[PDB]
Amino acid sequence: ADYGWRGKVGLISTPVIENAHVELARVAPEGVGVYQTFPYVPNFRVDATNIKRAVEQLETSAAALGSAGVDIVGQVGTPFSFAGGTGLEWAEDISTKLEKASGKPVALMGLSIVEALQERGYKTVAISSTYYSRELSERYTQFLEAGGIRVLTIKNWPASYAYKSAREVAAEAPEADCIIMSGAAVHTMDIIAPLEADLGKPVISSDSAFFWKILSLLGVRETSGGWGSLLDSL
Amino acid sequence: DYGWRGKVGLISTPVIENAHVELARVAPEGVGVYQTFPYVPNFRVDATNIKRAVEQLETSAAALGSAGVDIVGQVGTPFSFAGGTGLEWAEDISTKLEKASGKPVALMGLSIVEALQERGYKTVAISSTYYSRELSERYTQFLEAGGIRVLTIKNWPASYAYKSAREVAAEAPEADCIIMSGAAVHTMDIIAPLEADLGKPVISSDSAFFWKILSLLGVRETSGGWGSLLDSL
C-alpha cells in the first residue's frame, strides 16, 4: 500500500496559510492522499486586473497539481466562489477553468456548500458566520439564495463562540432545515457532531461541505470518523 | 495551533513525492508541514530548460515565503548537482531560494554533505538502488566535492534496500557511514534497524534533509526511532 492508493487530492491553498490539507487528512478515510500547492500572487489588491491575474495563478496551480498526478483538485477559499457580481455564474466559470487547466474534476470551497445543501434537499438554512463582516455576510446570503436556498437568519458579531452562536441561531430559527457555520479559517470539524447531537439538526460548515464534495468526486464513501451527518451520508 | 513549533514549506518535485508525509511522521509535535509544486512540464533537464526550472523553484519559494513558512526545503537530490562542479551550483540555488523566499533553505542533496560534515564522517559506502551509472558518478563527484571519500557505490522495494545496504557495508567495513540514495524509495523505517544490524551510522537522502530542516528550525526532538543522525539533533 503506497500513499494515496484510494485517491489523491490536490488542494490549492490561499496565502492565508490555510490548514485545510491537515483537516482533510484527519477526515479522509485510509488510503486517501492529500497534496497542497500555493499560487504565487504577490501584492494582491481587489481590482479586476488583479483578479484576472489571480485566476491565471489558480489555473497554473491547478495545472501543476494535474501534472503532479492528483485525481481531484480542490480550491480553498469560500468568498472566492462569489468574487464577482452576483449569482453562481462566476463560481461555475472558475470551476471550468480549473477543470480545463488540470484535466481533473474540481471542487471549490464556497460552491460546495450549495451543492451539499442541494444534494441533501435542504431548502432553508440558519447561518452563523462569526468570521464575516456585514458586507461579506449579505454577499454570502445572496450567493446561497442564488442556489435556491432561503436564509431564515444570519449572525456575526475560540470554539466557545462557534458552539454558542450555532446554538443561538438554531434557537432563533427552529424550523431551519440545516445550520451553517461559515468562515473557513475557524476549525469547526470537531464540533459538528456534538452540535448535531445537541440540536438534533444537520450542521454544515465550509470545511465539511468542501470535504464532502472532494470525497464524492473521488467516489470514496467512508470517512475516518465522527464528522457529522453530511459526511456520514457519503 | 498547527505549526506552533515551526512551519516548513516543501517544494515538491512533480513526481508526487510524498516527503511532506514522511516529514510529518518524523517531526516532533508542533512542527507544521506545507507543500507546493513548481509548474514544469516534464522537462527532463537540458541546457535549454534549466534556467526556466530555476525560475520556477524561485516562484515556489516565494509562494511559500509569502504563505508564512519559517523554512523552505527543496525536494530532489540530483538537482544539487544539476549544473557545475561540486557545490557551487547547490550553494547558488540555495541563495536564490533564500532571496526569493526570505527564509532559510534546505536542499535535499546538499543536506547529505552538511550532515556528513557535521557528524565528522569522512568515508562512506553507498547504496543507490534508484540511480543510473551517469547519475551515480555525478553523485559520487558531488560528495567528493564536499571532502568525502566514497569507498564504494553499488547500484540497481525494501528487501533490496536492506539487502543492498547490508552488502555495501560488508564490502567496505571501514566506512564511517552508509548512505542510501534515491529519495523516492521509503527508507526512514529501515534506518534504525540497519543501524542496529550493522553497528554503523546510516544516512539517507530523506534523513539528511529532515535533519537539516529541523536543525534550521532549531527543533531538537523527533517523534521517534529514526536513526542516530536524527537522534543527534
What DSSP assignment string belongs to A113-132? Answer: HHHHHHHHT--EEEEE-TT-
- Do the chains contact at B2 and A8, CB–CB below 8 Å? no
**Cell digits of residue B186:** 521509503
- Do the chains contact at A36 and B41, CB–CB below 8 Å? no
Per DSSP, the three-state class of A35 is: strand
Query: Where in the sequence is the domain holding B201, given as residue range(s)?
Result: 1-233
Q: Which residue of B15, B39, B58, B72 is the best one to mutate when testing the A interface, meaning the one whose CB has the most A CBs within 10 A?
A: B39
Across the strands, what pairs with B203?
Answer: B179
Per DSSP, the three-state class of A232 is: helix
CA–CA gap between residue B51 and residue B93 (Å, rounded): 11
What resolution does the deposited structure have, in angstroms?
Answer: 2.8
Side chain identity at residue A216, one-letter code: S
Largest CA distance in chain A: 49
CATH number at residue A60: 3.40.50.12500
- Chain B residues in contact with A65 by the CB 8 A cut-off are 37
CA–CA gap between residue A30 and residue B57 (Å, rounded): 32
CA–CA gap between residue B109 and residue B209 (Å, rounded): 8
- Residue-by-residue DSSP string for B110-170: HHHHHHHHHHT--EEEEEETT--HHHHHHHHHHHHTTT-EEEEEEE--HHHHHHHHHHHHH
CA–CA gap between residue B55 and residue B40 (Å, rounded): 10
- Chain B residues in contact with A36 by the CB 8 A cut-off are 20, 34-36
Determined by which method? Answer: X-ray
Across the strands, what pairs with A35?
Answer: A10
* Integer CA distances (angstroms), A212 to A64, A89, A166, A187, B13, in order: 23, 22, 20, 16, 28
Q: Which residue of B has its CA nearest to A59?
A: B39
Q: Which of A168, A160, A188 is nearest to A126 (CA)?
A: A168
Domain count, chain A: 1
- Do the chains contact at B42 and A67, CB–CB below 8 Å? yes
